Amino acid sequence: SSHSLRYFHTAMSRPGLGEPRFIVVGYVDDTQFVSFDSDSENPKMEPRARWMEQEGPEYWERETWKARDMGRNFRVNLRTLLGYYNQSKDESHTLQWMYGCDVGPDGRLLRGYCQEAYDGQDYISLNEDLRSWTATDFASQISKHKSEMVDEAHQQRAYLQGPCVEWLHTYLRLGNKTLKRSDPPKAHVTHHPRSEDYVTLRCWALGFYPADITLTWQLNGEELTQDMEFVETRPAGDGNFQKWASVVVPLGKEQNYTCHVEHEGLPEPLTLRWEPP
């Protein structure tokens, strides 16, 4: 019964336009709770969840300042890597940073993450021990050496083991009604005649949270693992998620197929068939 606090940072240079754009989004589990975007006039760290309005002014001002300064460092980093690689300014380049903590039911750290990518590829990563770095090419070897020199691992490890865990506990408390809601999917099967002989049965899962779900189809108890089509789980836009899964079946045989739904918010799994009337 775990939870996670995660931040996603992106700097993207725009050749012809101005300075690189810097974007931050922060998540508790599947819920976006804060953001920052340097394309805003007078850009600030912003709440993306209503319950984050409980953090007072000092929180927002300190996070804004950190973000702004971090954006500046991402800009320096972009210039540094252009230099390592002798690349053109006519192309845009992208630097990404993801870090965070997973905590178990006991509130203790299960694992910490801290990793960067340049132009969509792994550049440097903090190893699971939170003490050593894995580099990729010899540009990232240089970066690794510099981080070893300023004992960067110690600073990131200390954050991930202490404040990351504590802030996760705080946000879980502040946002408990939203964050612990376990909204089960409301499910139904729809019917779409396909070719006079065949029909599509589509099983719907709507308004659920968290995103993790299983939505499966069976023919007389046999799992249709080779036949079933499904879409990626997708946000409704309101904090909940959606999914569907479908099978093509012989018209007049629809009764033999079942949709099966599992989710944290369902104490028992759902079994559904297409209801004609």
Binding site: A67, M70, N77, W97, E116, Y123, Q156
Partner: peptide, 9 residues
């Protein structure tokens, strides 16, 4: 809250 600093590459 965010990491106190980022890597200098």
């Amino acid at each position: 809250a965010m990491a106190p600093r980022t890597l200098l590459l």
